[PDB]
Design a protein around this ligand. Structure first.
Ligand SMILES: *[C@@H]1O[C@H](CO)[C@@H](O[C@@H]2O[C@H](CO)[C@@H](O[C@@H]3O[C@H](CO[C@H]4O[C@H](CO)[C@@H](O)[C@H](O[C@H]5O[C@H](CO)[C@@H](O)[C@H](O)[C@@H]5O[C@H]5O[C@H](CO)[C@@H](O)[C@H](O)[C@@H]5O)[C@@H]4O)[C@@H](O)[C@H](O)[C@@H]3O)[C@H](O)[C@H]2NC(C)=O)[C@H](O)[C@H]1NC(C)=O
Ligand SMILES: *[C@@H]1O[C@H](CO)[C@@H](O[C@@H]2O[C@H](CO)[C@@H](O)[C@H](O)[C@H]2NC(C)=O)[C@H](O)[C@H]1NC(C)=O
Ligand SMILES: *[C@@H]1O[C@H](CO)[C@@H](O[C@@H]2O[C@H](CO)[C@@H](O)[C@H](O)[C@H]2NC(C)=O)[C@H](O)[C@H]1NC(C)=O
Ligand SMILES: [Ca+2]
Ligand SMILES: [K+]
Ligand code: NA
Ligand SMILES: [Zn+2]
Length: 805
């Protein structure tokens, strides 16, 4: 219980931690119904508005006013933000020319540049195009400071998961806020935007910036504002805080704006009605900057202007209804809209039949505007599976569409129209969902554009800007060093844990009883005394050094004319297979007599090899090769491609994808990019946590054997950023794209897979694009260790995501 009888006198927006039975006066008390009885009259003053007027200059101080224009206001930090402009002939910050801030210029008493995070809800990246015509203050931050053309949010692209991601550097599956609404089957409770439940700390995991700061003895302003506090008051409060005594003043502040999200929902992202909301946000920014200038802090503070997600054209007319697919939608609960999450309406209902539901939801309309996934089958880049609050059954919705349970849930007006024309929440690589980032201040670079990056990266950077050590998170610390003038983070290469063996030719064909047969032989190669020696293999095919193995295991480096690989004696297959394909490379066939050819590898003991018998006996599982016979450099070299040490288990369904990739796409990449270097390999993620499985976690083997089946196959395709130089002779920055393809028994994901592979395989691969960094997590390997670039540049490269938008 809170004793509301107390008073907020001399306590307004106090940074003091106060709890029951004492009443509060902080910027969140209203949200807790714990404000002292006079909080509003003493703390939310509104008299005379938010701006000084000529007739107010030098006034007698009336403590009833919202903000002051009296002579003493400056030293009290009470002035309306335009005080000096109206009353002292100064210029608005926005009218001042941009000037490089080479070192912080702070009043005495400031030991470090404060950080102010200015978050705008639903600010689509492309809104920035509206330029100084609409947002002159924001355009000055953007053009003069450091900006990205856009920033990638996390899925789902809604506000709660994104704001907490920004605060923690964690994926939603790790921090717990996996949606604006969610049900936790252990709590048996439902979290909603509206309601008290969300205030319960049990929902919020990880360690958000304000906690990290506090634990390390750095003072944080309040990172939450009750909706009833007008933005002008929030700004005045931050400026008031900044004027506090040296020993009370916070180092980090957060402003939040609910716009332009709401206007976007109402009017759509391209409505003429969006201009007004944008003007208002810009005005608020101008208040902050004017205020800062008044305080002599405009060349002292670092400011981050950042959005949580974008906004797409979505209207009532574009709603799919589950009732068109399912017989009883009244027995399920659906988290709806721009994503779908499905569970039984009655928790734990025994009659719930997810296999039958998914079957009815799979490719049943030719223009179907969503796709069902068991969560473990969602593209790995989304990192949306490892949490009990994430339903097993998910619907990825097509941009511009909604999914609903039944037409009852949709409310057309007499106009046949809906009240909303905008929404968001879709796949985070969708263009419309991209949001904004600008950094401005002494620690950021001047007039610099940086490539787009993910919002999970910012937590490390804000820690850097505040001299803090970040809690464990999903950012890659250093990948954003290029945004900063100073306070960069010097990364260190992870230490290799397992050294490879380099087995020579040791066994005889006679030693092998694996059930493998090859109808032909290359007897010439038996005469090559230096067969499979290093030679020039590593320098042609392993361009960026061997991947470091970062866990305890036993593996062999194997050399070949056309490829090199790191063969695991434990998983019975390569951890990685690396090869270079030149722009002019020739594609050839697998000779008919070699169709079913598999050859024992005399470098590796029979006990550490797969056996073809398992494959012959398993009527569902077939096999493929990591280095493709199609790209052999000669008929003689092609024999290497059929070694049992190049073989991996693949469902025929998957082989349709993989063969198209091996035979058609790699060459196409080489042709388009002036040669490519390829590293491919297996991934084991049976418990869908985005991390390499230990042996105990692998749950499927080839029939009758201990050959483990990968849940995915990866490929990393590198070339020279400067496409005029061949991949193998590159002098500068690299260009990379990667994939993590799901290894599945069918192609149900691909509604057109009945057609030729040229009609559907690439579409599938684009959906499963990935960062090299994703693959590192899933494999425990570390790539690009030997290059001519800085470690920081490599880190950036590893976080790159080729989105194909
Ligand atoms: C993204 O980055 C994060 C952070 O580094 C990585 O997540 C970490 O993964 C490691 C390795 O598996 C886990 O280590 C295990 O930790 C457990 C117990 O740890 C407890 O205490 C820690 C530290 O105080 C705390 O962070 C953990 O919090 C989890 O559980 C809370 C209560 O349920 C929950 O509120 C919170 O959201 C978080 O849940 C998430 O993680 C758990 C697994 O712990 C998972 O089941 C859940 O679905 C969420 O994903 C926890 O109380 C030890 O017993 C083990 O021995 C082991 O050391 C870390 O716990 C985990 N940290 C966090 C915050 O998630 C991700 O792997 C990385 N992702 C990728 C793809 O790289
Ligand atoms: C709730 O708050 C009010 C105001 O703080 C408390 O009223 C005071 O009670 C003390 C103790 O009897 C008196 O000496 C003061 O005169 C009261 N203050 C005023 C301004 O009237 C009240 O006691 C609190 N209720 C509790 C403690 O449960
Ligand atoms: C999947 O869709 C089929 C229709 O294609 C549904 O089949 C109906 O089944 C009910 C009994 O469950 C029958 O009375 C109807 O005659 C069937 N419809 C038709 C037109 O064949 C089936 O119910 C759906 N299953 C789920 C899980 O929703
Ligand atoms: Ca795993
Ligand atoms: K088979
Ligand atoms: Na299909
Ligand atoms: Zn919204």
């Amino acid at each position: 219980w809170t004793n509301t009888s107390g008073s907020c006198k001399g306590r307004c927006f106090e940074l003091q931690e106060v709890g029951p039975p004492d009443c509060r006066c902080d910027n969140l008390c209203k949200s807790y119904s714990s404000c002292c009885h006079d909080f509003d009259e003493l703390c939310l003053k509104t008299a005379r508005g938010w701006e000084c007027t000529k007739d107010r200059c030098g006034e007698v101080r009336n403590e009833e006013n919202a903000c002051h224009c009296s002579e003493d206001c400056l030293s009290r930090g009470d002035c309306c933000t335009n005080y000096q402009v109206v009353c002292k002939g100064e210029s608005h910050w926005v009218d001042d020319d941009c000037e490089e801030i080479r070192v912080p210029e702070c009043p005495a008493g400031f030991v470090r540049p404060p950080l102010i995070i200015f978050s705008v809800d639903g600010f689509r990246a492309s809104y920035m195009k509206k330029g100084s015509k609409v947002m002159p203050n924001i355009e000055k931050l953007r053009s003069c400071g450091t900006h990205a053309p856009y920033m990638r949010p996390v899925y789902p692209t809604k506000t709660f998961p994104n704001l907490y991601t920004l605060a923690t550097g964690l994926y939603p599956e790790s921090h717990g806020i996996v949606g604006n609404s969610m049900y936790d089957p252990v709590f048996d409770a439902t979290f909603h935007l509206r309601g008290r439940e969300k205030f319960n700390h049990r929902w919020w995991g990880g360690q958000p910036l304000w906690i990290t700061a506090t634990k390390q003895g750095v003072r944080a302003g309040t990172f939450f504002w009750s909706v009833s506090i007008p933005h002008e008051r929030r700004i005045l409060t931050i400026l008031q805080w900044l004027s506090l005594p040296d020993n009370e003043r916070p180092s980090v502040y957060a402003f939040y704006s609910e716009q332009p999200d709401f206007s976007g929902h109402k009017y759509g992202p391209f409505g003429p009605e969006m201009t007004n909301p944008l003007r208002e946000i810009d005005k608020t920014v101008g208040q902050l900057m004017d205020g800062l200038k008044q305080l002599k802090l405009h060349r002292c503070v670092n400011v981050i202007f950042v959005g949580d997600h974008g906004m797409e054209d979505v209207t009532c007319d574009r709603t799919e209804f589950l009732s068109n697919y399912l017989t009883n939608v009244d027995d399920i609960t659906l988290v709806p809209g721009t994503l779908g999450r499905i569970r039984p309406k009655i928790p734990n209902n025994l009659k719930y039949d997810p296999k039958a539901i998914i079957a009815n939801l799979t490719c049943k309309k030719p223009d179907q505007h969503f796709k069902p996934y068991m969560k473990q089958h969602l593209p790995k880049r989304l990192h949306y599976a490892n949490n009990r609050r994430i339903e097993d059954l998910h619907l990825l919705v097509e941009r511009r569409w909604h999914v609903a349970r039944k037409p009852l849930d949709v409310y057309k007006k007499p106009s046949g129209k809906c009240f909303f024309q905008g929404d968001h929440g879709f796949d985070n690589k969708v263009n419309s969902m991209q949001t904004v980032f600008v950094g401005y201040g002494p620690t950021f670079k001047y007039r610099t554009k940086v490539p787009p990056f993910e919002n999970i990266e910012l937590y490390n950077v804000m820690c850097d800007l505040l001299g803090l050590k970040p809690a464990p998170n999903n950012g890659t610390h250093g990948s954003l060093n290029h945004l900063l003038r100073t306070n960069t983070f010097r990364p260190t290469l992870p230490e290799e844990v397992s050294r490879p063996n380099y087995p020579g030719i040791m066994y005889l064909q006679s030693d092998f009883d694996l059930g493998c047969t090859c109808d032909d032989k290359n007897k010439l190669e038996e005469l090559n005394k230096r067969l499979h020696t290093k030679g020039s293999t590593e320098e042609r095919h392993l361009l960026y050094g061997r991947p470091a193995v970062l866990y305890r295991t036993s593996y062999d480096i194997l050399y070949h004319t056309d490829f090199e690989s790191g063969y695991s004696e434990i998983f019975l297959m390569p951890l990685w297979t690396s090869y270079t394909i030149s722009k002019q490379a020739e594609v050839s066939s697998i000779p008919e007599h070699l169709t079913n050819c598999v050859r024992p590898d005399v470098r590796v003991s029979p006990g550490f090899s797969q056996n073809c018998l398992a494959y012959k006996n398993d009527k569902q599982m077939s096999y493929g090769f990591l280095f493709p016979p199609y790209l052999s450099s000669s008929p003689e070299a092609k024999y290497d491609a059929f070694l049992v040490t190049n073989m991996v288990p693949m469902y025929p369904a998957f082989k349709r994808v993989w063969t198209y990739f091996q035979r058609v796409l790699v060459k196409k990449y080489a042709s388009e990019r002036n040669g490519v270097n390829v590293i491919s390999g297996p991934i084991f993620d049976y418990n869908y946590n985005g991390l390499r499985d230990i042996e105990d976690e692998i749950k499927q083997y080839v029939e009758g054997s201990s050959i483990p089946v990968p849940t995915h196959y990866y490929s990393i395709i590198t070339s020279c950023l400067d496409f005029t130089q061949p991949a193998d002779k590159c002098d500068g920055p690299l260009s990379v794209s990667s994939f993590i393809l799901p290894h599945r028994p069918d192609n149900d994901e691909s509604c057109n897979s009945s057609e030729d592979e040229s009609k559907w395989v690439e579409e599938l691969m684009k959906m499963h694009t990935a960062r090299v960094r994703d693959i590192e997590h899933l494999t425990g390997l570390d790539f690009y260790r030997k290059t001519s670039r800085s470690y920081s540049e490599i880190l950036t490269l590893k976080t790159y995501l080729h989105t194909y938008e």
